[PDB]
Design a protein around this ligand. Structure first.
Ligand code: NA
Ligand code: NA
Ligand code: NA
Ligand SMILES: [Zn+2]
Ligand SMILES: [Zn+2]
Ligand SMILES: [Zn+2]
Lengths: 16, 16, 16
């Protein structure tokens, strides 16, 4: 679960 | 803790 | 790992 959350934050960061 | 983090990312995603 | 993710979301929130 933690690896999917990490992936979601990375993209948000990337986008933002 | 993981369920609260999931909720926080979902909203960010939603907003963004 | 969860504490680093928490920190990353807090900043995103802060920024956003
Ligand atoms: Na994934
Ligand atoms: Na909640
Ligand atoms: Na840190
Ligand atoms: Zn993706
Ligand atoms: Zn809320
Ligand atoms: Zn920082």
């Amino acid at each position: 679960s933690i690896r999917e959350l990490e992936a979601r934050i990375r993209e948000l960061e990337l986008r933002i």
